[PDB]
Design a binder for this molecule. Structure first.
Ligand SMILES: Nc1ncnc2c1ncn2[C@@H]1O[C@H](COP(=O)(O)OP(=O)(O)NP(=O)(O)O)[C@@H](O)[C@H]1O
Ligand SMILES: Nc1ncnc2c1ncn2[C@@H]1O[C@H](COP(=O)(O)OP(=O)(O)O)[C@@H](O)[C@H]1O
Ligand SMILES: [Mg+2]
Ligand SMILES: [Mg+2]
Lengths: 487, 466, 22, 467, 127, 156
């Protein structure tokens, strides 16, 4: 029967041409006689272009290919938390079965125009530069982009480590479950990844979907979608998930492979005409749902690697266009000691103030304005001997706010902690303090306010903004602390 | 009659018909699907087989699955019942308010008005917005590039344009979301509801929305423009109106067409754009124009790839634009609304032979005084304001006073501010700046001209300042 | 003249005409 | 089962089999050759015909010529017996020292270790090379990569890594010659007999060799990296020990695949590469790794076509690496060797929780002053030196010294330098640089820090330059 | 080797320092010396066509440069000096040349005879 | 481009014309540092010819190296020496130009044809510094060196 089965005509480079299978559905999963999976991506008049989920060595000419009535779906639920699974939800951490009671299709339409409400609720990264100057919101898509080795994975990791503080709480509203998708990375790198999450006691609310460098092309292709579906379980059932796709360059590459070998037409950079579609249907599935639909959300931090900071390259062009903003990282900022290496002038979030608490929104706006006047001037810095007091103060402030944006890795900050430290700078208390000394200062000052003035930290949050009372306590804590420092 | 799917390769579907073949551009209805799957005939391969581009996902299609030739290109609902509605590329409502009940349907593929059907006259399309009318005025039936991007009053300007054209010219508006971000399409729709331009209670709506969301196939995003364009062609052609058509954004119309081109196996041209780049653009643009019956004017948002004005996409585009509105972040940060740059924004009809000797001279004086105000700001920083000559003291006052009079309150934001908006008639615009340049208001305080309608309301604002 | 260059033909013009000041 | 050659175009050979058809990856043996000719099965074309890549010249082949299927992939000798020996792609000895008497063999094609097999262990591998140890140091059992364009210093560096680290190694080393110079292999063979790490007289040899140099055809070059790798693998697992694996140059694996890609019928990807570049790389790179059973420290020379690091090949490699040493022609041009770019070389273990806060702070400082300098360069080159602040033009004088102090005479480059080779202990490197940043040598001349070992020799060199 | 062993790295360093010292203001004795050497070494490596030089003669010329004996001679006369110096040793000192070529080295003896020749020749040359 | 690139190796003498040079008014718009000849050899054309030519091309290349410092900071920032290589090169670029009998309508000058000796002596003299006192414009669009002199006096 050539309606429910077929024979392999030819096999190679992960492409099997199958004669028969007359009743296959476009994009259906079939099974080869050796037990490897296959996805039917090309249905041609006299053959089916099947894409091979494994080693070619197992498939020969004349091998029987079955339709098993299969359905490209993935296990979905809370039982995935604390687990590392492959692109299809198979456990690969050696801890046995995923005790999953539900499943979801990996290829599904994004919620439409009507079932959503404006992005409103904060998505706290715990990174000062981001929460203040490029703030993300629950449901937004925010691109993480930079050259190789600029700190892109870090931004996501810290963001995930940060949620701990909400998830161990009793506010169900504020909780955020995480999904980190490793596409095209090496297994050892991934392993160090989950070790760092485990050490930070972050794994318990994170799903790691890893389709690594030796996993066949189609697996690396589905992984973002499989991950995406798992994060939708939360979105649809009243909850909030964060999804990191790491990365999409590599995903596109896996798809480019399949397309070219399937002999589909090559375009710019040999990518096919549906590469934008590939990524745009993934990233639209991130969304803030309305109350009528449960009020949950899925936030996406897609990762894109540039080459020599070419943001105008085909795939970067696609994801920049698609997302709601971008966090751009640079190698020169990195080695300038600016870590994380976020370019504050270029990075954006079109959601903006809409996803900040009133506390941050206040001091943020000043910092943003003051760093921009700085950027107007920062060239007259090392060649400015005869500058007017006004432009001398723009630099001074500029150089100090800059130091306050530097941050250690693996230590995300509570939002009130950020505003207390931004406060130091925006109010000018550090204006007379040596640039090199600022990070040392911040560490000691913050330890002090977390140690002795937990109450004050309790009040910057509660109040929404900084009360006259909080403005009093800080005015005195800083002035005295600082004097002690320079003494 | 009914054909059979013989090949599915991504968003390209080949169908075989046993009898009469559906001509190119015809819309095909695929059977046995939960939602509507339209296939636009793209080619005739020979052997009774057509090549089609899918308007939705193709997951699930089976070789042999029946396909009904509708006998026409994609036909969408048009007429007054579309106003306040959001439709998709094939004419279905996606605002979940039920059928769009019109007495007419229209095909999205139409040839451009013939040589004889053209108005040989060049008319201004008064917007009521002072900056625009005076300095970069819209041609009735012309095309306008909108630069800026985010957080520059882009949505507010659009919404005010809709409102002002309904009021002053009795024409409606159409919004074509080409590569609309679902999220932003949700936001814009509500922003329109809240400003009045869409009204969900009665039938007073002024815009019709057509959304081609980013997660739709190449062929969908390439065609949305056409869908919206036809909705607009109804109002011009059947009702005799002067219509506004917003295209957001024109770059994604190009790219979408580039992706279609790439899927059809065609050879890419310079920089990887479709070889039919110019024609793809041409057959859509030429429909935007003044006929003897009415006009469609289009406001088109432009993205310039790589900041390259010589990139084939913006190059090709610019050939069709008659004016640019440039929205700048600098100007917004100076509290000027609309954030329109008066030096960057140009118009092809800024020509005395079109707008009149007088309208010409005032614009060129306003342009000149603002240029000359930019020349002094360094000497202002160097010698202070009191080391200017007495003629130069004036240019600054006047310039700064012109700068503010170019600002203006919008009706579309009466809700957010408490200030009554102003549609300012062309002659009052011409007069206000005419009289400022002459120094007929040098004695008045600088702040009297800020956020005001006509020149009378500046004298009114100056007399109220204790 | 002075210590600081980048003032065009200043220092050269008097060096052409040539204890020095600057 | 027996097959017949039906098409021969360069390295690609189409073979027809009437009965049983050999599965992809199988080694086929060409009949009627003087030296053993293996064809590896690459594709099933259809019509009982298989597409194969050749492991040697195809000159002399005739349509109709007989081909046997060995019934399995290329199997090679693995074990103690490979030590001190030299192998080719197909496990034949090429040292004219007779048969390779092993108890067992191994397929050169194998599945990568699973995620559960991974180790998170990482502790410094000190090299005695200032710039590596300081700014981007290697880890034990880590994946190191040496990026460089044509003739900037990859091989020299890897030779020094072999000298400084592989003599004093308790376990076993493996060197794989992948698509490089045959002259370098002779060079390496006799330098190791001299150093003793290979011995021709007893069984104390600590290094196995595998060579397939640029004088070989594409197929040979496309598999020889796996042959080396497989020898490495056996030592990791079936003995468990510390394996060193040196590969010069891994790029040549990717280039070889591209050489045959059009004949295999692929549409080319960008920059003319095979579309399967990343995955071909993935399934290969992923075997090169430390597992729970055993530790491989792997060092890989990585060519950078046309000096452009964004080149698909080198660009796709970075992520398979735990430490990256990037060498630059611009820097070599100045005479700074090793020509390591300090603003583009990285290490996973460059972190205070690991190398300590002292090492980390120094390193970060060195990059800071160097990057600050880099952005002043083009600027003061035209706008004149004198306009600078007296604290700025000190960071100019200090960075220029630190750049030189990054240079170092290598033991294996005596023929290039005129200088004696010098190995700098880790602490001395940290201390030397710490001191330059401090300002302790602002009075010392620039050229004093050039091409020396430890900070002492810069001070000594300063006096010799004083007259 | 005796004469050229460190020359290559020296010259790459030289050329980088010339460029960095292009904005000419007061320099140390270290960099003034490297430049003086480089500009002179550089003239030494200039050569016409169709007259390849025997190794011994190559060594003699370079020798005069690397040992610093031309450090105080005007750079634009270096070319003229080399031809004079060369044509001198070719007739007057075929024994020295013969010895360098046969030995393949500059022995402590040759070193003494080379030094003596180039010093007293240069002086005569610069009279 | 493959067409011309492949053509070079078929020629005994090249004369590469340069848009940029033509747009500066120098005609014929010959690039002096991209035109080559296989008889540019002291044993064929004589040492005098060879020496002047190499001298002309030397000062033209040194000047070309100085043109980026010029384009940002201009004449003034150059040492007294560089100014001399500049002044001389620019006089040399101009004296390379010539009115052609065939181009008299575009140039406004009667066409000139200079004997080889006269050509050598002209550039020789500009290299020895003999005309350092003359203003550039005198060298533009003349034949023998003597005409440049006459045009200098004519400029008063
Ligand atoms: N805020 C920070 N401060 C200091 N170091 C950091 C910071 N964030 C990241 N790093 C380090 O910078 C290096 C690279 O960061 P990483 O997260 O790998 O970014 P990436 O751009 O994703 N790199 P890759 O995936 O290897 O191309 C690692 O050594 C990190 O430990
Ligand atoms: N450490 C070094 N010290 C001095 N010279 C070097 C050094 N490394 C390389 N070189 C010079 O550069 C050349 C190329 O080195 P090699 O290691 O073969 O480069 P690659 O392998 O990057 O092509 C060497 O022959 C030598 O002349
Ligand atoms: Mg990363
Ligand atoms: Mg090498």
């Amino acid at each position: 029967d050539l309606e429910e089965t077929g024979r392999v005509l030819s096999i190679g480079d992960g492409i099997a041409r199958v004669h028969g299978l007359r009743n296959v559905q476009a994009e259906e999963m079939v099974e080869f006689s050796s037990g490897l999976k296959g996805m039917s991506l090309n249905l041609e008049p006299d053959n089916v272009g099947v894409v091979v989920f494994g080693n070619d060595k197992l498939i020969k000419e004349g091998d029987i290919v079955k339709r098993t009535g299969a359905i490209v779906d993935v296990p979905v639920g809370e039982e995935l938390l604390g687990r590392v699974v492959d692109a299809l939800g198979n456990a690969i951490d050696g801890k046995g079965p995923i005790g999953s009671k539900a499943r979801r299709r990996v290829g599904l339409k994004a919620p439409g125009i009507i079932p959503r409400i404006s992005v409103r609720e904060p998505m706290q990264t715990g990174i000062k530069a981001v929460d203040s100057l490029v703030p993300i919101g629950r449901g937004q898509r925010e691109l993480i982009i930079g050259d190789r080795q600029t700190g892109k994975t870090s931004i996501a990791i810290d963001t995930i480590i940060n949620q701990k503080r909400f998830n161990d709480g009793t506010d169900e509203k504020k909780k955020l479950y995480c999904i980190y998708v490793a596409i095209g990375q090496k297994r050892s790198t991934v392993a160090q990844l989950v070790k760092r999450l485990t050490d930070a006691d972050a794994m318990k609310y994170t799903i790691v979907v890893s389709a690594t460098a030796s996993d066949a092309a189609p697996l690396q292709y589905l992984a973002p979608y499989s991950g995406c579906s798992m994060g939708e379980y939360f979105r649809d059932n009243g909850k909030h998930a964060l999804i990191i796709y790491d990365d999409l360059s590599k995903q596109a590459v896996a798809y480019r492979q399949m397309s070219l070998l399937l002999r589909r037409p090559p375009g710019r950079e040999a990518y096919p005409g549906d590469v934008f579609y590939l990524h745009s249907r993934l990233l639209e599935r991130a969304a803030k749902m309305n109350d009528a639909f449960g009020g949950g959300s899925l936030t996406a931090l897609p990762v894109i690697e540039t080459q020599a900071g070419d943001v105008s390259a085909y795939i970067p062009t696609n994801v920049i266009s698609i997302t709601d903003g971008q966090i751009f990282l640079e190698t020169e900022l990195f080695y300038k000691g600016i870590r994380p290496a976020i370019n504050v002038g270029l990075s954006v979030s079109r959601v903006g103030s809409a996803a900040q608490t009133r506390a941050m929104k206040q001091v943020a706006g000043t910092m943003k304005l003051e760093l921009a006047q700085y950027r107007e001037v920062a060239a007259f810095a090392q060649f400015g001997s005869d500058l007017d007091a006004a432009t001398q103060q723009l630099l001074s402030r500029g150089v100090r706010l800059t130091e306050l944006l530097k941050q250690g890795q693996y230590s995300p900050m509570a939002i009130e902690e950020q505003v207390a430290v931004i406060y130091a700078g925006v109010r000018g208390y550090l204006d007379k303090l040596e640039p090199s000394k600022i990070t040392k200062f911040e560490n000691a000052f913050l330890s002090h306010v977390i140690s002795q003035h937990q109450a004050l930290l309790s009040k910057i949050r509660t109040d929404g903004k900084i009360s006259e009372e909080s403005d009093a306590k800080l005015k005195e804590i800083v002035t005295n602390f600082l004097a002690g420092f320079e003494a | 009659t009914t054909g059979r799917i013989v090949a599915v390769i991504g968003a390209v579907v080949d169908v075989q018909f046993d009898e009469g073949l559906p001509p190119i551009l015809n819309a095909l209805e695929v059977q046995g699907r939960e939602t509507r799957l339209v296939l636009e005939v793209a080619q005739h391969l020979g052997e009774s087989t057509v090549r089609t581009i899918a308007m939705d996902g193709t997951e699930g299609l089976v070789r042999g699955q029946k396909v009904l030739d509708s006998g026409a290109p994609i036909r969408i609902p048009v007429g007054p019942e579309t106003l306040g509605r959001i439709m998709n590329v094939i004419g279905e409502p996606i605002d979940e308010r039920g059928p769009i009940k019109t007495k007419q349907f229209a095909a999205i593929h139409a040839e451009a008005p013939e040589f004889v059907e053209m108005s040989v006259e060049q008319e201004i399309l008064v917007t009521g917005i002072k900056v625009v009318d005076l300095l970069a005025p819209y041609a009735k039936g012309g095309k306008i590039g909108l630069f800026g991007g985010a957080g520059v009053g882009k949505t507010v300007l659009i919404m005010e344009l809709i409102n002002n054209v309904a009021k002053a010219h009795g024409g409606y508006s159409v919004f074509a979301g080409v590569g609309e971000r679902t999220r932003e399409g949700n936001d814009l729709y509500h922003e329109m509801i809240e400003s009045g331009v869409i009204n969900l209670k009665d039938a007073t709506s002024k815009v019709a929305l057509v959304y081609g969301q980013m997660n739709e196939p190449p062929g969908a995003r390439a065609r949305v423009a056409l869908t919206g364009l036809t909705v607009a062609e109804y109002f011009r052609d059947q009702e005799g109106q002067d219509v506004l058509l917003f295209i957001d954004n024109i770059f994604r119309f190009t790219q979408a067409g580039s992706e279609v081109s790439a899927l059809l196996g065609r050879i890419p041209s310079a920089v990887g754009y479709q070889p039919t780049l110019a024609t793809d653009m041409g057959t859509m643009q030429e429909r935007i124009t003044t006929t003897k019956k009415g006009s469609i004017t289009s406001v088109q948002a432009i993205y310039v790839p790589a900041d390259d004005l010589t990139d084939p996409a913006p190059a090709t585009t610019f050939a069709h634009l008659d004016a640019t509105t440039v929205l700048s972040r600098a100007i917004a940060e100076l509290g000027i609304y609309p954030a329109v740059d008066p030096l960057d924004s140009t118009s092809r009809i800024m020509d005395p032979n079109i707008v009149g000797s007088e309208h010409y001279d005032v614009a060129r004086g306003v342009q000149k005084i603002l240029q000359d105000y930019k020349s002094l700001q360094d000497i202002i920083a160097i010698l202070g304001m009191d080391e200017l000559s007495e003629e130069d003291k004036l240019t600054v006052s006047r310039a700064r006073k012109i700068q503010r009079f170019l600002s203006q309150p919008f009706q579309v934001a009466e809700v957010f501010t408490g200030h009554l908006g102003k549609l300012v008639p062309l002659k009052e615009t011409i007069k206000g700046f005419q009289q400022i340049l002459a120094g007929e208001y040098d004695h008045l305080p600088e702040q009297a001209f800020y956020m005001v309608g006509p020149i009378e309301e500046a004298v009114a604002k100056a007399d109220k300042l204790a | 003249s002075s210590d600081r260059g980048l003032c065009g033909a200043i220092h050269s013009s008097v060096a052409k005409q040539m204890i020095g000041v600057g």
